[PDB]
């Protein structure tokens, strides 16, 4: 019958001052037949009411999906709280209970590295600037690139990849016109993440 | 009832001589009511039957999951041939026909670039060596390093990220003692994809 499934608030809005971040449960294969979903939000066991229950659009698979949202503490998910979603529909002969939190196991400080363009790129109209953060843990993060203050349109970041030594590394590139490269124009990798001091650190990178 | 998944070759497969590609298809949730189930290969419509029905191991929650394996042309992957699988069961009402090729629209050759650790790294025992790959279609690639005609252990790569323009890119991380790296050793990075010559290409990496 019904499957439930369950999302993690983004790793800015966990980092940053004054944002909202966002647990999500999201239930998928509800019929026309057993359609009246409910649900209910616990913290570290003890029940919450603060949350938002999204009224159900239907599908293109003829189901119904129903999406309820519960802001949280960013100091709350950072101190690691649990936070169960209970379900209730007909169509299950139980409850369905899904449990999230932050990725458990030691944090690790991101290393942040920037990367010039590599000298046989320098003969294509646009460049690519590139910046490699690893050693982190949890894999929950936030990159991005800006220029004088201001943030960049056309920059590309992967994945959190495991490394070998179970932490976390990914890599951002930044693509710019030739001219603003050589022109000495500075850029910079803005790193978000908890083992960071004041969760925020920056790398620059320009000519030489 | 029974959900069918379906799987492509390997990249490496399809792109170096005398490899053994193969397109998998992958049956779960069978009960053991109805946990008889039957496959029927088809290549671009027409049907062949050099297929490889592995028999049902159980699992661990009480359903069956069996595994056809179609092994394939190189050349017949790499010219669009369709492949469908099609499979038979009694929970279902009708049998599921899931089909699978290699990706359409224009192949793009891949621009591969090396990257030299940033200046920072070169303070820890280790250093991260980097390979650039950019600008290809479709996403299947390989990317292996290696150092005097031998391959390398301790390497990560990213998945394939879809860029601004619709192609592909992807990095590759190479760690090596740091050592390694100021006695001036060389290292390479293999790249095979569709779009290269002989599909293969190779961009070294030293000290300077
Ligand atoms: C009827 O249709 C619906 C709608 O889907 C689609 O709608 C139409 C219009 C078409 O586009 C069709 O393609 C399709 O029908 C179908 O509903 C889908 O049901 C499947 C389950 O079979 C769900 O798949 C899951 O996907 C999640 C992650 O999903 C996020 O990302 C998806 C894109 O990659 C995106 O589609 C989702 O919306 C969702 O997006 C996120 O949403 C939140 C909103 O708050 C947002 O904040 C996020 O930023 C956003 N992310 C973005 C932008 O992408 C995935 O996690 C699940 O994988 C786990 O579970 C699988 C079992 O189903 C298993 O195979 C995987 O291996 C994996 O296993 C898990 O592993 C983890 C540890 O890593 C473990 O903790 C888990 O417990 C474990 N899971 C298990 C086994 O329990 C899963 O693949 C889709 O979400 C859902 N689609 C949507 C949009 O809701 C439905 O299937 C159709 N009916 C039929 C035919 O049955
Ligand atoms: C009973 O158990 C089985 C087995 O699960 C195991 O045991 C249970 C108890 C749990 O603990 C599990 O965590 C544990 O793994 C369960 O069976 C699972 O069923 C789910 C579907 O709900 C399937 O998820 C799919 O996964 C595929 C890709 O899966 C590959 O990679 C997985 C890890 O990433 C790996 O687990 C798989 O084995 C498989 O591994 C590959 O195997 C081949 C073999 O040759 C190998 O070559 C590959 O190298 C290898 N790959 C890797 C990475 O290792 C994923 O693609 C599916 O996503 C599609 O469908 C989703 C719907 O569930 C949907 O949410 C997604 O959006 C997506 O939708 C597709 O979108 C694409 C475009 O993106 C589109 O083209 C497709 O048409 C569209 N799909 C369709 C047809 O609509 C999906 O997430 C698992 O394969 C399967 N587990 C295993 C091990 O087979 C089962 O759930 C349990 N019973 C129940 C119901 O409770």
Redesign the interface.
């Known amino acids: 019958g019904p499957s439930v499934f369950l999302f993690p608030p983004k790793p800015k809005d966990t980092l940053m001052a004054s944002r909202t971040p966002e647990v999500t449960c999201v239930v998928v294969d509800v019929s026309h037949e057993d359609p009246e979903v409910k649900f209910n939000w616990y913290v570290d066991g003890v029940e919450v009411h603060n949350a938002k229950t999204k009224p159900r659009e239907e599908q293109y698979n003829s189901t119904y999906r129903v999406v309820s949202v519960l802001t949280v503490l960013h100091q709350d998910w950072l101190n690691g709280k649990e936070y169960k979603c209970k379900v209730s529909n007909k169509a299950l002969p139980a409850p369905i209970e899904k449990t999230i939190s932050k990725a458990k196991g030691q944090p690790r400080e991101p ?1 942040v ?6 000298r ?2 320098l003969t294509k109209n646009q460049v ?1 600037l ?1 910046c ?1 953060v ?1 050693g982190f843990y949890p894999s929950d993060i936030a990159v991005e690139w800006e220029s004088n203050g201001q943030p960049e349109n ?1 920059y ?4 959190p ?4 030594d179970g932490s976390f ?3 951002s ?1 930044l ?1 710019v016109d030739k001219s603003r490269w050589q022109q000495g124009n500075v850029f910079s990798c803005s790193v978000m993440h908890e083992a960071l001091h004041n969760h925020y650190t920056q ?1 620059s990178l320009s000519l030489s």
């Open positions: 290393q590295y920037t990367l010039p363009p590599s046989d790129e690519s590139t490699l690893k056309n590309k970041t992967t994945p990849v495991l490394d070998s590394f990914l890599y590139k693509t790398k």
